[PDB]
Amino acid sequence: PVENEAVAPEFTNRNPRNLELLSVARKERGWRTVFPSREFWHRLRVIRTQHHVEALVEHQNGKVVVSASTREWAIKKHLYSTRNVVACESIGRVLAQRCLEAGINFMVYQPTPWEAASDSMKRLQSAMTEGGVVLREPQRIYE
Amino acid sequence: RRTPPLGPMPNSDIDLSNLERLEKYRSFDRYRRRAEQEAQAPHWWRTYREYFGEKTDPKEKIDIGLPPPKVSRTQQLLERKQAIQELRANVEEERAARLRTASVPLDAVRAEWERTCGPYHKQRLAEYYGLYRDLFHGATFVPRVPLHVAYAVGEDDLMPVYCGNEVTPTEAAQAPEVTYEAEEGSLWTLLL
Amino acid sequence: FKQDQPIDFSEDARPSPCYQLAQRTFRTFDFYKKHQETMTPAGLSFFQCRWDDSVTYIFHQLLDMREPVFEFVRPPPYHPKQKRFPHRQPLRYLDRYRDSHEPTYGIY
Amino acid sequence: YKTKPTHGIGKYKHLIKA
Amino acid sequence: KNILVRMVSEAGTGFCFNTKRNRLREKLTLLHYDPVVKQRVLFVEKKKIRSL
Amino acid sequence: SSKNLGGKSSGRRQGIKKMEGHYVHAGNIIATQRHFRWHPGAHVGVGKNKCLYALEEGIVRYTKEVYVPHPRNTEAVDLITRLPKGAVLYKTFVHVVPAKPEGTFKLVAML
RNA sequence: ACCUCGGAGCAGAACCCAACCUCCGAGCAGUACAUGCUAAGACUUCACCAGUCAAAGCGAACCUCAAUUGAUCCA
RNA sequence: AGAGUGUAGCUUAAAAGCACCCAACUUACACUUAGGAGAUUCAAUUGACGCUCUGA
Ligand SMILES: [Mg+2]
Ligand SMILES: [Mg+2]
Ligand SMILES: [Mg+2]
Ligand SMILES: [Mg+2]
């Protein structure tokens, strides 16, 4: 017999980013009567302030994996006025780049209608889609 | 049969009188921010961050990384102020901002991010995947010196690895090319 | 990692072939505990790996063994205890506890 | 519940006068 | 007030349903699902058998 | 002389059928009632008659979280905007903590 | 005076409980017919006859109100 | 002459969060959208340039 054939009938995985990569992870359904409900895997948290624009990507637990804000010197020195549309466009582009460099390429964007009707959010979504990451995560296998 | 509350009520710090003089919520975003900020405060009753398992977040870990270099923050701040003031004097940037057409280079911002808060994002992405939980068993560090590794497969492109990339085994059959800045007088030990 | 003084170790060395899975049982915790006051971590980079067609050739001409297979199985669905008189139940109630969907015959 | 210490937490009409 | 009529399909004759309608209006020409075709065809009001 | 009529009503049998601690499977109705008394939280769906049913197998928990109304419901919108700076609601939410996993890895063949 | 059903207190914080105790009502409605077909799990007006929610799939673009009603035979 | 002091109007913040105004809708208020101006007073925990109080 070969001593390297120690496989065992049961095999476990110690990676949290595994169940959602095979479309077998359960989504925390429910809520319904409130909005941003927890039936997703990755969200696109956007915070717009009168001084800076910050965008984060959080998981269903409550921790951010990647964020993009104008407070960083890497973005603040390449543009002017962190309030216009080009600032949020560059923020969306650098966030798409960082998420492509991080492997994540599926997130759910559920903004408000008054913000979705604006132009900054539309251009940010366009820059996110043109980067290589499409929004709207697919369904779950055996939900 | 009435029991006293085991803590301060969430709607008890305000008074029920003179309500016409207090400023009401003029919008809904302020209420949403207030709710999401109050939901993070540790309460004394049954909350969501208790039953669904949080792996005990209030627990200080141990840092086993290199300390940050001693850099004067006031000098850096005044230099950044002078830089943004000299950049604001341009009129072409103003025209580009007014015409909604202003692009920024990607390589420059990537290099500046890797030089600045790069290690912080790398550490938070490593602790998100649970690397420090399985390797050092809770102990975490911060990669100060940047690291760059690119595989060699075809003849023109490359297969790089960043902080969570995806490399196929057919494109990683040979030894890659590790490149990192180092001085003459220090040894390193690579582990995979 | 980053070590201070030049220190050499021999109890963690591997042979030139090193194609045995029983000898590659490496542990980073014990390796860092044995060398704590010498090496210091300073770099980290991780990626994701999936299955492809090269795994077969690897297991063939690199480990001298067979390729193990797996399957994401699921627990069986829950069903209450089958009573004698299922009051207000559809006709498909007997098929929920039925073994095989074939007409079985006993003494006939 | 009425007897639990968390009684009267969902009250909201007492903070308004309209 | 209202009236109940039956809608006959153009393609695949044999499948008809019932739907409400106003009494002072004209006929109906809606889009209803047809199981024998598994698509969407036209339905025409024909033969009323209810006066509610 | 017997002016009132129609007061011969019956009980709707509405209430909580599964308290905190019982092992509730997937599909069991938590509690049927009128009006949103116990708002759904995690793994708790709703229907047409404002009922509560579980979605996964585990232990049903009853906590009190914040209430963020939907922007489309204008009634709740004005009810929130009529609140002073620093007023919360905190209603009772029903959560179902899952215990059994949704699957695992098992060896089949060996080639 | 009434013949069916729902709500408010009696019945106060899981549930049920009657009176020829005091009041509002209902035999319907403002707009699209995927108001398509199958299929785990429950409540159930204190029995039965009845009524209601829903995992998932094929199929499709990306439902509001509180009672609001009619069984066997036969045509 | 003495004392209290020291981040724009605010900080049991260390260059951020609250604030202000203008352009679009509104009889009007208001949300929202599109924009703008804002600060660690000086030399290395020290001493002095700004305000207030106690006096003459
Ligand atoms: Mg009654
Ligand atoms: Mg009765
Ligand atoms: Mg019963
Ligand atoms: Mg479905």
Side-chain angles (χ1 to χ4, degrees):
Chain A
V2 181
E3 60 180 0
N4 299 330
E5 296 181 0
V7 185
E10 182 178 0
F11 179 81
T12 181
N13 197 322
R14 304 173 61 185
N15 182 26
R17 188 64 180 270
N18 175 33
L19 300 178
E20 53 272 21
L21 294 181
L22 301 180
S23 300
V24 298
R26 55 167 56 93
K27 300 180 180 180
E28 192 174 25
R29 299 177 295 182
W31 309 101
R32 295 273 69 181
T33 61
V34 291
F35 42 143
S37 58
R38 218 62 175 269
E39 187 181 0
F40 63 92
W41 294 337
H42 298 272
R43 61 190 303 265
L44 184 58
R45 178 60 179 271
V46 47
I47 299 180
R48 297 188 60 180
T49 325
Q50 58 179 1
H51 302 160
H52 298 270
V53 179
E54 182 180 0
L56 304 88
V57 178
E58 300 180 0
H59 197 64
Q60 62 179 0
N61 48 16
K63 60 181 61 180
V64 56
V65 297
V66 55
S67 60
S69 60
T70 60
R71 301 179 300 180
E72 180 180 355
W73 175 247
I75 300 94
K76 189 178 182 179
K77 73 176 182 178
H78 286 274
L79 44 79
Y80 165 75
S81 176
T82 67
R83 185 57 180 178
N84 49 20
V85 191
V86 295
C88 75
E89 181 180 0
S90 300
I91 288 301
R93 292 203 306 176
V94 69
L95 180 60
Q97 181 67 21
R98 292 177 184 179
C99 80
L100 284 175
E101 296 176 0
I104 169 180
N105 45 9
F106 287 99
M107 58 181 60
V108 179
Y109 198 2
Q110 39 184 349
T112 61
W114 51 80
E115 290 179 359
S118 60
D119 301 330
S120 300
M121 296 294 100
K122 290 182 179 180
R123 294 191 62 179
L124 190 146
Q125 294 180 9
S126 300
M128 180 66 60
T129 52
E130 293 292 338
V133 175
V134 57
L135 303 180
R136 184 183 60 184
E137 297 180 0
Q139 300 292 339
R140 173 194 171 191
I141 306 179
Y142 291 100
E143 191 176 1
Chain B
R1 188 63 178 181
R2 295 299 181 91
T3 59
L6 301 180
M9 298 273 85
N11 294 326
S12 60
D13 56 79
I14 56 180
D15 58 330
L16 283 74
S17 60
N18 301 120
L19 297 179
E20 292 79 359
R21 299 181 179 180
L22 273 65
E23 181 179 0
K24 306 298 181 301
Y25 277 150
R26 60 183 184 90
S27 60
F28 187 80
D29 53 355
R30 289 186 173 183
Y31 178 82
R32 179 181 179 180
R33 293 183 62 179
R34 181 62 179 181
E36 70 92 8
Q37 186 271 349
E38 188 69 21
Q40 300 179 0
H43 302 288
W44 56 269
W45 59 82
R46 305 290 84 90
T47 180
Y48 174 80
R49 302 178 181 179
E50 181 180 0
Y51 282 148
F52 265 85
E54 285 69 27
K55 301 178 300 300
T56 68
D57 288 351
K59 179 59 181 180
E60 181 69 22
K61 297 300 180 180
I62 295 91
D63 189 9
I64 55 180
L66 298 179
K70 178 59 181 180
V71 179
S72 59
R73 192 171 185 176
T74 60
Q75 181 180 180
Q76 187 182 38
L77 259 56
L78 62 87
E79 288 180 0
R80 291 177 177 180
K81 290 179 181 300
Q82 294 180 0
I84 64 180
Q85 182 67 210
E86 294 180 0
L87 190 143
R88 186 178 299 181
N90 298 331
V91 61
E92 54 275 6
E93 300 292 338
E94 302 291 340
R95 296 192 183 98
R98 294 168 192 175
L99 294 180
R100 306 300 185 272
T101 55
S103 300
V104 295
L106 300 180
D107 300 330
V109 63
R110 167 66 194 277
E112 190 66 25
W113 163 80
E114 186 68 22
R115 187 177 181 269
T116 54
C117 64
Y120 297 154
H121 294 192
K122 295 179 60 60
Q123 177 182 0
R124 71 181 178 180
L125 273 173
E127 72 92 8
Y128 166 73
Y129 283 78
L131 297 182
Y132 309 110
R133 179 180 55 89
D134 302 330
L135 294 176
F136 305 95
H137 295 63
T140 178
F141 66 97
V142 41
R144 296 300 180 180
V145 46
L147 183 142
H148 301 270
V149 168
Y151 289 85
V153 184
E155 53 85 23
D156 180 71
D157 299 330
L158 81 166
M159 291 305 304
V161 41
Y162 302 102
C163 41
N165 204 331
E166 180 178 353
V167 180
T168 59
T170 178
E171 295 168 334
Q174 300 293 338
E177 303 292 337
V178 45
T179 56
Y180 60 95
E181 189 273 344
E183 67 282 351
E184 293 78 10
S186 60
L187 299 181
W188 310 87
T189 53
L190 196 151
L191 175 57
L192 175 60
Chain C
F1 300 89
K2 179 181 180 180
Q3 57 182 0
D4 301 330
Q5 51 88 14
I7 174 63
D8 301 331
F9 56 93
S10 300
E11 64 281 352
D12 297 80
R14 307 302 178 181
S16 28
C18 191
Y19 292 155
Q20 302 293 338
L21 286 77
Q23 299 181 0
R24 290 183 174 269
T25 60
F26 187 84
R27 297 181 179 180
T28 58
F29 185 82
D30 299 331
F31 184 82
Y32 191 85
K33 180 62 63 60
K34 293 179 181 180
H35 301 71
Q36 180 180 359
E37 301 179 0
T38 58
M39 60 201 307
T40 301
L44 177 55
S45 180
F46 67 102
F47 65 96
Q48 303 296 146
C49 179
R50 304 188 62 177
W51 184 86
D52 61 333
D53 54 354
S54 61
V55 182
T56 65
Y57 295 91
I58 287 180
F59 273 94
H60 178 267
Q61 61 186 5
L62 288 177
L63 302 180
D64 200 334
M65 59 176 298
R66 297 181 178 90
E67 181 188 15
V69 304
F70 295 96
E71 178 180 355
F72 188 81
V73 300
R74 297 181 178 270
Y78 171 76
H79 298 270
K81 182 178 181 179
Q82 183 178 6
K83 301 178 299 180
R84 182 178 299 270
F85 292 92
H87 182 55
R88 301 192 63 178
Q89 294 292 340
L91 185 60
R92 57 183 179 270
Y93 182 82
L94 299 181
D95 300 330
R96 305 173 184 177
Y97 306 95
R98 185 181 304 271
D99 300 330
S100 60
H101 299 270
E102 298 180 359
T104 176
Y105 293 81
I107 61 180
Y108 300 93
Chain D
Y1 196 78
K2 183 178 300 180
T3 70
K4 296 303 179 180
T6 60
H7 179 55
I9 184 178
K11 305 177 62 61
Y12 58 93
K13 292 186 179 300
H14 67 282
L15 298 177
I16 59 180
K17 298 300 180 180
Chain E
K1 184 61 179 60
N2 301 330
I3 191 178
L4 181 64
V5 297
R6 181 172 64 259
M7 309 295 297
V8 54
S9 60
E10 294 288 343
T13 60
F15 181 82
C16 300
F17 72 103
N18 300 330
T19 177
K20 59 179 59 180
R21 192 195 65 177
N22 197 333
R23 195 176 183 178
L24 282 74
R25 66 175 300 180
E26 58 180 1
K27 302 180 181 300
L28 295 180
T29 308
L30 305 176
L31 298 177
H32 183 64
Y33 166 71
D34 202 336
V36 70
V37 195
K38 298 182 179 180
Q39 295 183 3
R40 297 182 179 181
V41 298
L42 289 177
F43 282 74
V44 184
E45 188 268 89
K46 178 182 179 181
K47 186 63 62 181
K48 51 182 180 180
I49 55 178
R50 189 63 177 91
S51 300
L52 73 159
Chain F
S1 300
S2 180
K3 183 63 62 180
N4 304 126
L5 49 88
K8 303 178 181 179
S9 60
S10 299
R12 300 162 299 183
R13 305 299 168 95
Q14 294 180 358
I16 300 181
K17 279 76 181 180
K18 297 298 180 180
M19 295 296 180
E20 179 178 354
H22 298 172
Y23 190 88
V24 177
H25 302 270
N28 302 23
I29 291 185
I30 300 180
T32 56
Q33 58 181 353
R34 60 163 58 258
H35 301 272
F36 295 92
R37 176 173 184 179
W38 298 289
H39 293 255
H43 302 273
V44 177
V46 296
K48 299 182 180 180
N49 63 90
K50 295 172 295 300
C51 60
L52 301 179
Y53 58 92
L55 295 177
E56 299 292 338
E57 300 180 0
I59 301 180
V60 176
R61 299 297 182 179
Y62 299 90
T63 60
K64 299 180 180 300
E65 311 297 330
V66 298
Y67 183 79
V68 183
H70 199 270
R72 290 184 178 182
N73 186 272
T74 60
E75 295 79 8
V77 165
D78 63 66
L79 190 144
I80 290 300
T81 56
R82 287 177 182 179
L83 299 178
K85 182 179 300 300
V88 295
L89 276 64
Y90 271 89
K91 287 182 171 58
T92 302
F93 289 86
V94 182
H95 301 262
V96 179
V97 180
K100 299 180 60 60
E102 68 282 356
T104 180
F105 303 94
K106 183 63 62 60
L107 188 144
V108 182
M110 184 61 179
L111 47 84

